[PDB]
Design a protein around this nucleic acid. Structure first.
Ligand SMILES: [Mg+2]
Ligand SMILES: [Mg+2]
Ligand SMILES: [Mg+2]
Ligand SMILES: [Mg+2]
Ligand SMILES: [Mg+2]
Ligand SMILES: [Mg+2]
Ligand SMILES: [Mg+2]
Ligand SMILES: [Mg+2]
Ligand SMILES: [Mg+2]
Ligand SMILES: [Mg+2]
Ligand SMILES: [Mg+2]
Ligand SMILES: [Mg+2]
Ligand SMILES: [Mg+2]
Ligand SMILES: [Mg+2]
Ligand SMILES: [Mg+2]
Ligand SMILES: [Mg+2]
Ligand SMILES: [Mg+2]
Ligand SMILES: [Mg+2]
Ligand SMILES: [Mg+2]
Ligand SMILES: [Mg+2]
Ligand SMILES: [Mg+2]
Ligand SMILES: [Mg+2]
Ligand SMILES: [Mg+2]
Ligand SMILES: [Mg+2]
Ligand SMILES: [Mg+2]
Ligand SMILES: [Mg+2]
Ligand SMILES: [Mg+2]
Ligand SMILES: [Mg+2]
Ligand SMILES: [Mg+2]
Ligand SMILES: [Mg+2]
Ligand SMILES: [Mg+2]
Ligand SMILES: [Mg+2]
Ligand SMILES: [Mg+2]
Ligand SMILES: [Mg+2]
Ligand SMILES: [Mg+2]
Ligand SMILES: [Mg+2]
Ligand SMILES: [Mg+2]
Ligand SMILES: [Mg+2]
Lengths: 111, 23, 55, 212, 116, 122
RNA sequence: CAGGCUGAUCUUCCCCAAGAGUCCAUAUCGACGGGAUGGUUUGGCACCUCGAUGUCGGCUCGUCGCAUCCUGGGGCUGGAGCAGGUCCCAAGGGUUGGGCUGUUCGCCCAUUAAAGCGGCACGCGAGCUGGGUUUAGAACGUCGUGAGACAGUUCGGUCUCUAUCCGCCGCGCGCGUCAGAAGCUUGAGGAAACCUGUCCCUAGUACGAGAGGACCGGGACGGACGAACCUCUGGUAUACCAGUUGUCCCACCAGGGGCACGGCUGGAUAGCCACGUUCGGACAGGAUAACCGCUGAAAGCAUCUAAGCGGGAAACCUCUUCCAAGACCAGGCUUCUCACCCUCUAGGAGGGAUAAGGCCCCCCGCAGACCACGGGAUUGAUAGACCAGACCUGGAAGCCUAGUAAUAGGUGCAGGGAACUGGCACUAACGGCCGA
RNA sequence: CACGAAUGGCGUAACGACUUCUCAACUGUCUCAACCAUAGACUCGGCGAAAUUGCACUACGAGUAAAGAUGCUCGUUACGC
RNA sequence: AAAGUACCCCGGGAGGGGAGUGAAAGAGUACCUGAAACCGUGCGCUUACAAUCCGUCAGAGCCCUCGACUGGGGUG
């Protein structure tokens, strides 16, 4: 793969191995005018998009009676650390059926 | 207009002697 | 859209001259105590014996 | 006004000093030998001719080989000029000077010229950004067609520079400005921000920006 | 293999997959066939990727060759004769020869045959 | 991408219930509002008891949108809900509270009272 | 219907000022009367066409004029400031989306820096629509004894054509540029582009009784528009993976296949794309417009002018991007072959064979209607295969354990697989026609 | 202006490929287009029409003219196919 | 007047070239004479920077021809 010789610096090895289906607890660095903070996003991993720095992953909270869905680059400087707390098996690459579902029917089952 | 005026000023050419067959 | 005029004797010829044939441009093969000759794309098949030159 | 030939090596993304994503088009400007220096006495202008890219000696044409033999240089793939302003700038080049991508210095702006992708006879909609006619409400066989092309009995013709239909792309183009994110000295690559014209592996002339 | 860029020969996508099956199953029987040159070039990457399944001996590969071809004498002799023959050779099991133009349509013919 | 016509169900109380977009402000031929961009609106559904009637023209800011946007550091947000908050002449919402997560782009836009309210900023 | 002449009527300016403006005709309005421009309205006329010049509004595409709607530069003000009025200059760019009506026009709605006016057969139906008008059907009001009639309403009502020529948008072939070739170029002459907002500082300072509130110059973030590109997000996917319904077939069970819109459904790399992310509109210089001037006569004084010398706008030149020596004034800087042979009515002759190079064939492409352009051609990584990865799908077949069974779990991040990446000659890149 | 009582007046459940207005659902009708497949178009081999036609080695601008010119005037512009 | 081409060769045939028959195939059953439109082949002269009711008049050059030792043709 061409442009492997430029990727090596940005590729962090702090990320633990996870897959789609897994409940993952992503802490994020929020830089604002008052102060730097660690906000934390908490939800189920929907997908992974592959290919070095360019790969991303998508997490789904469901907060206060509305779905929110937030993507990050996996090798972002802003991503601080990722705690993988419940691993679960979903029989699928990319879980777009969770968009429609709401409720208790969107509950993923642990391995 | 412009085309109407200019045709009738071809009367004064010296060859025409102050009259030109309009129509 | 219909042709308004009959096309001239000069103009009909000058277009019509572009409609031509080129080719072949032969190369000297050998087979069976004789040369013949052949197009260069068929130069492998001529000596190997997939084509027949009696036609 | 410095310049360098190179190739487009494809795109990636790299994170900032202040943690933003900048999308970066990777070019590799290899070691270019200045072959001939055009001078204002004989030619009537000032320019520098740059050689780039490795080629086999047997591939080279004898007319072309003798020009490189005059320079004292191993023959190359591509060659092109940098036109530069005034007489003074050609004073600091010597034939056989092998310049590299280290010169540009992080946070510069460039022009980055290069021939575009051919789109291959696109008409009207793709080429010029026309609107087509409506897809429904009667419309008989006009859904992507140009429409009218002219007035009537005066002028009784189509004007020159009417926008129709024909072969699109392979234009020389230019990006303008386009910040250099990072000069990498080892490997010989420049991370330039944003898109640069052309296919992956096409010839590309990076020079410092005239507008800047 | 790589998909066809242009319109699919046969005049359909389903016809193309059936056509390449009937061309391949004929080629492994006889060992030689003659077609139009575009059909000959389309057959090469199809035919070689059955011979790689042949030389790798397993039941798994007997199933996946049988997803195409659809004939028991051919899938036998593909694994019996042809498979262990080209166990020696790495790739490139097939060649193309030019057989001059067809009479009615001037379609350029080509013979496609096993290397041996 | 709120556009013209369309239907947003309001985040803030105020008895609005639902609103239809008339104009996206801040330019001529300006197509798309999203999150930080204001709109002119019109109340469709409404509630019997409230300080807004049915069918009155009001300003509003977007807060959730179902299309996703880049933000910065390649980090996108995407909601299930096209929502908005009806505002006063300047900036303060006439609705006294706000429901659901607003975008964190609101802080940049200066609606500091809206992000001061609401369960979270995200 | 359209063109032509005419210009009563319309339309844009103008002469004279009775006046109104506290006073003061000319800051701004300007009666009565007079003189012209424009051809854009209603007309007059009957000159071209009735062996046919086919039709209002809308859509698509525009192109020019300035009598300027906005942005830019000025004078005067009954111009404090902000915001105006009025007149001169200026055509580079920009001049929104909806509601009602067949509409044009118009009334309204929410915005905008602004929602300009016109010509081009009231531009544009061998480009499109057919709602309006204007055939045949039919009812209503009216007039007629009646057949029927009405720029009175109402509902329904076939839109034909394979581009010869010029024209325009792209692309080659053939000679030419005083020998034949190749590489990089010069720029005569063109084209494309040219929009503008808010907000923070300067400063609550100038200015004003307060209310209000700046020029000039800084800095940040925009909208619409254009061009590149595919890293990201998003769409597409007809030889990719898995799920699944009905039915026939592979002897049958298991496991697969054909057909049903690609049978349907969930994802989907490359490619092409925008809804995506980058970038652009310049910064200077020169000669000017209206206007402001300096020094100064004729005319002892005066005066921007008569001689001369300046300032001065998005216009005009140049700068920026792209094409370009078929630019017949056919250019320049290099490098490479540079040499033979015969015939004749023997001279800017006709061949023949070549050299430096070109083309055809051959292997292809992210170049492509064809052609062309760009690579590769055995001293070879151009394409296929094979081997490895990337990436996509989501846990294959077989055997085994559990379950009375649908099914579940372990061998196993498995198996399968196209475009992206390297390695590897295994298959296919094997001899003719031009050319001083 | 100018409805009217069997050229019937005023209503009327059910019915209508009738005309009219509104509503929810859904949608490439649209904002604003994008991509894929097939059939023509395009290339090569074969066969092989047609309407039409005073001529031809058929530019453009401002004019003039039976009052809208490829052909007339004066310029400008244009290598052959 | 059939004397309608025996025979040989090219070819799958058709069709032809020799050979014959006849006064003549310049009469071959596609048949007396065989015009023009239209359709080719060869040979001169001209033409690829030029706006052509396609002619006309002036006219360079080139190519044939006659006649003494310049008259006519073709081209433009
Ligand atoms: Mg007049
Ligand atoms: Mg459309
Ligand atoms: Mg259609
Ligand atoms: Mg494809
Ligand atoms: Mg099928
Ligand atoms: Mg008339
Ligand atoms: Mg007319
Ligand atoms: Mg008449
Ligand atoms: Mg006629
Ligand atoms: Mg003016
Ligand atoms: Mg019209
Ligand atoms: Mg029509
Ligand atoms: Mg027309
Ligand atoms: Mg109608
Ligand atoms: Mg009566
Ligand atoms: Mg009907
Ligand atoms: Mg044509
Ligand atoms: Mg057509
Ligand atoms: Mg104050
Ligand atoms: Mg990619
Ligand atoms: Mg059976
Ligand atoms: Mg079974
Ligand atoms: Mg079947
Ligand atoms: Mg899908
Ligand atoms: Mg894709
Ligand atoms: Mg080549
Ligand atoms: Mg009665
Ligand atoms: Mg009665
Ligand atoms: Mg009655
Ligand atoms: Mg009745
Ligand atoms: Mg009634
Ligand atoms: Mg009925
Ligand atoms: Mg094609
Ligand atoms: Mg054909
Ligand atoms: Mg004219
Ligand atoms: Mg003439
Ligand atoms: Mg005869
Ligand atoms: Mg002339």
């Amino acid at each position: 793969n061409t442009l492997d010789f430029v990727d090596q610096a940005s590729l962090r090895d702090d990320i633990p191995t996870f897959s789609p289906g897994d409940t993952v607890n992503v802490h994020v660095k929020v830089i604002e005018g008052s102060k730097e903070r660690i906000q934390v996003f908490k939800g189920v991993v929907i997908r992974r998009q592959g290919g070095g720095i360019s790969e991303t992953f998508t997490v789904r909270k469901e907060s206060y009676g509305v779905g929110v869905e937030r993507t990050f680059p996996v090798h972002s400087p802003n991503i601080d650390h990722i705690d993988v707390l419940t691993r679960g098996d979903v029989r699928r690459a990319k879980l777009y059926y969770l968009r429609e579902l709401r409720g208790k029917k969107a509950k993923i089952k642990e391995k | 207009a412009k085309r109407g005026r200019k045709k009738r000023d071809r009367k004064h050419s010296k060859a025409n002697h102050g009259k030109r067959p309009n129509a | 859209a219909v042709p308004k005029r009959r096309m001239s004797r000069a103009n009909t010829r000058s277009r019509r001259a572009q409609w031509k044939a080129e080719a072949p441009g032969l190369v000297t093969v050998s087979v069976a105590g004789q040369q013949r000759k052949v197009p260069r794309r068929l130069l492998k098949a001529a000596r190997l014996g997939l084509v027949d030159l009696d036609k | 006004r410095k310049g360098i030939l190179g190739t487009k090596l494809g795109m990636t993304q790299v994170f900032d000093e202040n943690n933003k994503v900048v999308p970066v088009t990777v070019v590799k400007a290899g070691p270019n030998v200045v072959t001939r220096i055009r001078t204002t006495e004989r030619d009537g202008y000032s320019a520098v001719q740059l050689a780039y890219g490795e080629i086999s000696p047997r591939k080279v044409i004898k007319p072309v080989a003798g020009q490189f033999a005059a320079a004292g240089v191993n023959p190359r793939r591509h060659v092109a000029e940098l036109r530069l302003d005034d007489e003074a700038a050609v004073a600091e080049y010597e034939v056989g000077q092998e310049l590299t991508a280290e010169i540009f210095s992080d946070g510069a702006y460039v022009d980055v010229t290069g021939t575009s992708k051919g789109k291959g006879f696109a008409g009207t909609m793709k080429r010029h950004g026309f609107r087509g006619q409506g897809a429904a409400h009667g419309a008989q066989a006009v859904h992507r067609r140009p429409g009218s092309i002219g007035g009537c009995a005066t002028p009784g013709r189509v004007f020159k520079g009417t926008r129709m239909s024909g072969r699109m792309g392979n234009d020389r183009v230019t990006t303008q400005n386009l910040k250099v994110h990072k000069v990498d000295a080892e490997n010989g690559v420049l991370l330039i921000k944003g898109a640069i014209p052309g296919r992956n592996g096409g010839l590309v002339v990076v020079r410092s920006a005239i507008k800047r | 293999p790589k998909p066809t860029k242009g319109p699919r020969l046969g005049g359909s996508s389903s016809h193309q997959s059936a056509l390449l099956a009937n061309l391949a199953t004929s080629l492994f029987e006889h060992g030689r066939i003659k077609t139009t040159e575009p059909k000959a070039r389309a057959l090469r990457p199809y035919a070689e990727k059955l011979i790689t399944h042949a030389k790798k001996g397993a039941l798994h590969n007997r199933r996946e060759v049988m997803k195409k071809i659809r004939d028991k004498d051919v899938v036998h002799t593909l694994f019996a004769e042809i498979g262990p023959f080209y166990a020696d050779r790495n790739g490139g099991y097939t060649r193309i020869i030019k057989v001059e133009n067809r009479k009615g349509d001037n379609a350029p013919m080509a013979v496609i045959e096993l290397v041996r | 991408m709120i556009q013209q016509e369309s239907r947003l169900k309001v985040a803030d109380n105020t008895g609005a219930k639902e609103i239809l977009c008339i104009r996206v402000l801040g330019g001529s031929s300006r197509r798309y509002a999203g999150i930080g961009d204001v709109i002119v609106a019109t109340v469709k559904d409404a509630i019997p008891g409230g300080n807004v009637k049915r069918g009155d023209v009001v300003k509003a800011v977007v807060v959730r949108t179902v299309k996703e946007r880049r933000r910065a550091d390649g980090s996108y947000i995407k909601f299930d809900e096209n929502a908005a908050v009806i505002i006063k002449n300047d900036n303060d919402p006439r609705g006294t509270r706000i429901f659901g997560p607003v975008g964190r782009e609101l802080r940049e836009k200066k609606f500091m009272k809206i992000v001061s309210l609401a369960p979270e900023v995200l």
